[PDB]
C-alpha cells in the first residue's frame, strides 16, 4: 504494498518525497526518481516534499546535482521538518517555488582517513557556499548559525531566505 | 495483502484511515494519501476515519497542514477513539463535516535537548490555540481539560465542539 | 498470497470474515471492509462470518457502530465459535438474518488509569445494554450469564436469542 | 508463488485441497474456499482432495458445517491419507461421490478448563454420531475402532462405508 | 518494491545505474541490462549513471566488454562518486558522451594462488592500458596516479580526460 | 524484483544466463529455461551467457543433456569467466556459435561412499571425453591441462578450441 | 550471579522466597529448598517470604505437601502480594507463625481433556477445603469470595484468618 | 562477573543499591538483601544508595515494609537521582540518617480491572500519607507537588524534608 | 572471566578503571567501586585510570559526587583518551595527583520533555562551573572551548590545567 | 574457561600476551595487566609475547605508555608475527631484552573529522619518531619502509634493530 | 565446563591437545600452554596429543618455535589424524619420543597481496626444509609427496620417518 502503491501513484503526479534520513540508498532512489520524471517530460514541474532529518552531505549533494541536471523546475515543500541536508535541498528548489507548510520547521546543523578529511572539507565548504547562495546570507552567518544549531519557524524560515512562500491553501 | 488491498480500494473512494499511533512514518503515509487524492481531483471531498490513540505533535501537525493545503474538503469521522492528536485531527475537519459514530469517544490529553524544548513549547502552544479555534472554547479550558485527561462521549463531544454531527445511518 | 487472494475474491461477493481475536488492527480492517462494501452498493446485503474468540470491547464496538452506519443489512453467521465480542457482533446482525451453523457454539464472557476505568465502566454497561436488546433478555441475566461464563449450543443459542436461524443447507 | 498459483488455478476448476494438519487457520481458509465456490455457482460440484493427518475436531467440524451449508454437492477424494478429521471430512462428502484412490489409506483415531471439557465431550460425541451416520456403522463400532486406532486400505475403506468408489481412471 | 519499480521504469527509458560495489552479482545484472536494452533497440543510446566505489576488476571488465559489445552508444554520467572500476566505466563511455555532475568526484585507485596472480597481473595491466587510452594519458601517469590514490574534482576530471562535459542543466 | 524482471524480459529474447556456481538448484532452473524456450519455438536459437566459476559435474551434465535435447541451436558466450563446468558448457555450444568476449577468460580445472566413487569416476571420464571432443584435443591433454589448472586468454581459448570466435561488436 | 548469591546466603539463614508465578519449575525448586533445609536441620524453623501472583494449583499443592512433609515449622510472610496459590501457601504456614507486612495484600481468586477435568475438579475442591480449614471460614464463603475475586488489606486478611499477625518491627 | 563481584563485596559492607527501575524483580532482590543483612547482624546500620527513576508503587511499598521490618537503621543516600518511588524510599530512611549528595536531585511524580483500581487507589493514598509523614508536609502539598512533577535540588530537597543532610566529605 | 579477574585483582590494589562510555550502569559500578574502596580503608589513595569517550552528564556527576564523598584522595590518570565527562573526571582528581600519560589526549566537548530541559540546563551550567574551577580557567573559555570541540595534547592539557603532571616512569 | 585459566596462570608468572588485533578493548586489558603486575611487584620483569597483526595507533600508544609507566623491565618476544603496532610494541621493550623466535617475522606498515585528522597526524608522526628511536634508524627510513610495507625475517629484524636477540633455547 | 575441566586437569599432568584446525587463536592457546608448562618445570616432559586436520602454516610455525623454545622434551602422539601442519608438529617432537597410535593416520598436504606471497613462499620453503629434516627424507620427496596428497598408515608413517614408535600399551 500500500505505501509503495501510494508513492508510485504520486510519482505519476510528478510528486516526490524525501521522508527520512538522507543516506546513499535513498539518495540514489530520489535521483532515480528525478531522472525518470525529467525523462518522461522535461517541461512539467516536479514537486519535492521534504520531511527529513537530513543526512550524508555527499549523498545530499548528489540529489542537488540531479535537481540541477533536470531541465524542469523543482518545487520544494517543507512539510514537517527540513534539517541539515533536508534544509539544503529545501533551499535548493527553483527560486520562486520554495514553500513551507505553516508548522514546518527548518533546522540548520553543522553536518557529520586523511584522504576522507580533504574530501569532506572540500564538500562542506561547497555546501556552505551554496546554502549562502540559495539563501541570500553571508557564508559567515550560514556557518555561525549551523554551529549554534539554529532552528526556524515557517515564518522565520521565510525571512532568512530558505523558502519563498508559506502556504495555507493550495492551487 | 488483503488488508492493503482493502485500504487501496477504499482510497479509490476517497476514503482514508488514521487507525493507529500518529508517528512520523504513518504521518508521512497519510499526508501522501491526502496529497494523492487532492492531485487526482481537487473538488471532491476526502473522508478521513479516525480510530487512533494519537501520538507525536509535529507528526500530527504535518497531517493537519496537509489537510489545510488540500483544496478539497476533509470530512472527519470519529470511529472508535480519537485521542490526543487523533482528537485534534478529528476536530480539524472542515466545519460542517465533522462526525462522531454513536459509541465513538474523544480523549483530550496533555501531549508527550534545550533546543528541542523550545521547539516543543512553540508547537504545543500552537496546538492548544488551534484546538481552541476548532472547538469554540477558550484556550484556558483546552489546557485545563488536557491536564485532567478529560474524555467525552459522542454526545459530550458534540457539545464541546469537536464534532458537528453524531451519525446513525449514512447518506 | 493465496489466503489473501481468497478473502479478496470473497469480498467481491459481499462476504467478510471475523476469523480471530478482535483487536484494534483487525477492527480497523473489518470496519474498512464494511465501509467499502456499503460504498460500492448501499442496497445489497453484507455477509459476516464469525469464528472468533472475541477481544477488546471498544474495538468490537467500533465494528458494531460501522455495521449500524452501513445502510445495508448485515447478515451474521456463527461458524465455529462466537465468544465475547464475537458473540456480541453475531447478535448485532440485522434481525431475521442472524445464523448459527449446526456445530457453532456461542460463549458469553465477562470481558477484559483512573481515567481508563471510567471509560471502561461506561462502555461495558453499554455493551450489556445492547446485548440485552439484541437478545431479548434482561440486563440482569446478560450480566449473570457473563459472569458464569455460560456457553451455548447452536440450538441453545437460538433459544436465548443470539441468532434467528440454525442453517443446514444454504439458498 | 508457483504453489499458490497452482492452487488458485485449480480453484477455478472447483478443485480444493486439504493437504495438511486441520488447524483453525487452514479450516478458515477451506471454509473460505467452499463459500467462494458456492457463491460463484451454487449448482456445479466442488471437488475436495484429502491428504491430511486430520487435526482439531471443532476446526474440522466448521469445515463440515460449511460443506453442509454450500448448496452444491461436495465430492470427496482420499488421495494418500485421510486420518482423524481428515477421515471424517472424506466420509462427509455427498453420498455417491466419495472416492478413494487405490493406494489411499484411511485412519480412524480417538481425537485430541472444566468448561473446555464440557464442550469437547459434546463435540466428540457429535463427531462419533455423524461418522456412524456417514458410514452406516453403529456408534459402538465407530468408538471401539477409534480407540484401537484402526486403519483401512482403499478396499477395506469402501467396505466399512467411508467411501463410495475406488477410482482407477477418471471421467 | 518501490525501489525496483523505479529502476524498472527507468530501464524503459534506457537509463541504468551502477550504484554500489562492482561485484560479480551486480556485474551480471548490469551486463544483463545492457544486453536487454541493446536487444530491444540497437540504435538508441543507453545512459549509465555511476555512483560507485568500484570493485572487482574482472567483474568491471565484463561490464566493459558488454558496453563495447552493445552496438549502441553508452552515455556515461558520474553522479556522486566514480572510483576504481567506477572511474574506469565512467571513462569507458562513448567519447563525446561522458559526463560529470558538478559535485561528482573521480577517484583513481590501485585495485584489489600462483595461477590467480598471473591472471590478475594480466588483467591489471590491461586495465591500465585501457584507462590510459580512454583518458589520453600515458600509462606511466595512470599507474603513478593510481598508487597515490589521486582524486579529481568534476573540473579536474574533465581536464585529465575521464569525462567530456560537466553538466549543469540537461537537454 | 528488478533483477528478476530483467532476466525474465531477457528470457523473452531467447537470452539466458549462467551467472554463478553450477549447483543442482541453478542447474534445474537453467534446464527449465532451455526446455521452455525450446517448447516456445524449436527453430530459433538460444543464447547462453556464461560467467560462472563452474560447479558440480552431474549438475553441469544435466544442463548439457538439455542443451543437446533442445532441437534448436545454443549459442554460447564467455562473458567474464568460464571455469570448470562453466568452461565445459561454453565449449558445448553449437559449433560455429561459440563466442568469447575480449577479456573473458577460460579456466580448466580438475573437478570436485564407495558407490558415489564409482558414479563420479564414470561421469568424470565422460566429461573429459566430451571436453576433448568439443575442443579438438586429445583426452591426455584435456586431463594434463586440468591437473595443472591451466587458464586461457580469449585469444588462447580460441586457439585451444573452446570457442569459435572472439567478438568485439555484435550483429 | 549477585541475585543467586543473595538467595543462597539467605538459604543458609533458613529463609526462602516465593517471588513469582507458581509454575512447575519454580514449585520444584521451592520443594527442593524445603527438603534441603529440613534435611539439614529438622528442628529449626523455615521462613517463607511470599510475593507471588500465585499460579498452577497442582504446582502449589506440591509445595504445600512438602511444607507439611518437613518436620519443622514453616513461618509464612506476606510481603507485597499473596494471590491465588500464593494466598493458599501464606495461609498454609504453621498456625501462630503466619505474618502479613503492613502494606501486604491478599487476593483470593477462582483458579485456572476429559481426564484433566476430573483431576482439576478433584484438586480444586481439595484446595477450597484446605483454604477453609487454614482460614477458619466455611467452604461456601471460600468459594463465593474466590468467584468475586475478593482482596484483602493486611488488617482485613488478619480478620478473615489468612494470617496470625501483622508485623511492624521484627525480633 | 565484575559488576556482581563488586556489589557482593559491597554487600559485606552493609552497603546496598537501588540503581534502576523499581520493578517486582528488583524489589524482591532488594528485600532479600535487606533481610539477609538484618539476619546477619540486627544491630549494625544498612546503607542504601539510591539512583533510581522509581517505578511500581506496590513493588516500592514492599521494599519500604522490609526496611521497617529490619530492626536496624537504614541510612539513605540520594546519589544522582531519586524519583517517584526512588524519592519515597530516600525519604523513608531512618530519620537523621537521610542524605543527598551535592548534585543529587529529587523528583516527585504522580505515579503509574475494576478490582485493580480499588487496590491502586488504596495504595496511592497510603503512599501520599507516608510521604507527607516522612517529609513533614501536608498531604495536600504532597499531592499538588506530585501533579506538577516538581523537582528538587539537594539544597531544596533538604528544605522540603526529604533528607536530613547534604554530604560533601564522608566519615 | 580473565578480564574480570584482572580488574578484581587490580581493585585490591585500589586501582580502578573508566574504560568506556559513561552511562548509568557503568556509573553505578564505578561509584560502587569507589564506595567499597573507601569503606575498606578511608586513608589510602584510590587510583582512577581514564580512557573513556565520556558520556551522560548526570551519570558522570554521580561519579564525581562519590569521589568527593570518599574521604580518601583520588588520583587521576589520563591513559589514552579523556573526553567530555571523561575529561571532567580526569580534572576532578585530587589536586596534585592528576596525571596524563605522554600520549594521552584530552577532548572538551559540548555534551548531549520541558522538565528534562530545566534539569539539563541546571546540570550543564553546574558542570561548566566545576570544570572552570578544576581547571583554573574562566567559565567563558570553558564554554567557548567546548563548543569548538577543542582537544589537547598531554603537554597542552597540563598547561590548560586539566592535569598536574605528565608521567613517564612511575614510583 | 580453559583458555582463560591458562592465561591467568601465565599471568602469575609475569607472562602476558598480545595475541590479536590491537583495538581499544584489548589495549585496555593489556594496560590493566601491566598495571596489575607492576603493582604486585615493581622489581621483577614482565614478559610480553607478541603475535599480533597490530591495529589502532592510539590504542597501541596507550599500551606503550603503560609499559614506560611500569617501573619494571618489559621483555618483548616476537612469537609468530609482529606487524604495525605489534612491531612497535615489540621494538618498545626494554633494550637488551627484545627477542625474536627463529621463525617470527616483523612487518612494518603505514598505519590506518577535520579534528580527528589533526590528532592522527600528531600521533602518527610521534609513532615514527619513537620507532626510529627504538630501532636506531633515521625517521626517513622508518617512513619509506612503512610505505613499501617492508617485512623482516628474525635475522633481518635483528639487523634493523627491532630486537636484541634471536632465541633458540630459553634460560 | 566439563570439557575444559578435563583439559585443565590433564594440563596438570603435562598433557596437551591439538584437537582441531590449527588457526591463530588455537596456536596462541597451545603456545601459551607450552610456555606455562615449561615455566612450571623446565625438566619434565610435555606430551602433545595430535588429532588435527592441520591449518595455517605460520600459526603452526609459531607452535613449532615454542616447542623448540621450551627447554624440556616434547613427546608427540598421533591419535586419530595428523595432517598438514598437524603432521608437521607430530614430526617435530623430540626425536625418540614421537609416537603413532595403531590406527592413527598421517596426511601430507600442499598447504594453503604481492607482499603476502613473498612471505608465504619463504615460510613454505622453510616448512618443507624442516619436514625433510624431521623426517630424514629429501626435500624433493617431501614436496612431491605433498602435491600428490600422500597419506600414511601408522606402519607407513614409522617407515617414512614421521614417528619413532607405534604404541600399543603405554608405560
UniProtKB/Swiss-Prot annotation, chains A, B, C, D, E, F, G, H, I, J, K:
Molecular function via GO: ATP-dependent peptidase activity; ATPase binding; serine-type endopeptidase activity
Keywords annotated in UniProt: Cytoplasm, Hydrolase, Protease, Serine protease
Database matches in InterPro entries: ClpP, ClpP/crotonase-like_dom_sf, ClpP/TepA, ClpP_His_AS
Name of the protein this chain belongs to: ATP-dependent Clp protease proteolytic subunit 1
GO cellular component: cytosol; endopeptidase Clp complex; plasma membrane
High-level lineage: Bacteria, Bacillati, Actinomycetota, Actinomycetes, Mycobacteriales
Job description of the protein: Cleaves peptides in various proteins in a process that requires ATP hydrolysis. Has a chymotrypsin-like activity. Plays a major role in the degradation of misfolded proteins. Degrades anti-sigma-D factor (rsdA) when present in a complex with ClpP2 and ClpX. Does not seem to act on anti-sigma-L factor (rslA).
Pfam families: CLP_protease
Annotated EC: 3.4.21.92
Subcellular location: Cytoplasm
Entry-linked Gene3D superfamilies: 2-enoyl-CoA Hydratase, Chain A, domain 1
Top-rank lineage group of the source organism: Bacteria
Amino acid at each position: 504494498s500500500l505505501t509503495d502503491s501510494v508513492y508510485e501513484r504520486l510519482l505519476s503526479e510528478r510528486i516526490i518525497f524525501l521522508g527520512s534520513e538522507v543516506n546513499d540508498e535513498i539518495a540514489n532512489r530520489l535521483c532515480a526518481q528525478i531522472l525518470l520524471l525529467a525523462a518522461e517530460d522535461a517541461s512539467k514541474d516536479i514537486s519535492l516534499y521534504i520531511n527529513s532529518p537530513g543526512g550524508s552531505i555527499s549523498a545530499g549533494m548528489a540529489i542537488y546535482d540531479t535537481m540541477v541536471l533536470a531541465p524542469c523546475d523543482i518545487a520544494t515543500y517543507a512539510m514537517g521538518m527540513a534539517a541539515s541536508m533536508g534544509e539544503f535541498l529545501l533551499a535548493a528548489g527553483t527560486k520562486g517555488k520554495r514553500y513551507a507548510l505553516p508548522h514546518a520547521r527548518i533546522l540548520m546543523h553543522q553536518p557529520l582517513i586523511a584522504i576522507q578529511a580533504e574530501q569532506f572539507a572540500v564538500i562542506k565548504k561547497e555546501m556552505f557556499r551554496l546554502n549562502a547562495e540559495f539563501t541570500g546570507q553571508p557564508i559567515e552567518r550560514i556557518e555561525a548559525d549551523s554551529d549554534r544549531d539554529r532552528w526556524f519557524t515557517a515564518a522565520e524560515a521565510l525571512e532568512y531566505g530558505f523558502v519563498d512562500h508559506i502556504i495555507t491553501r493550495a492551487h
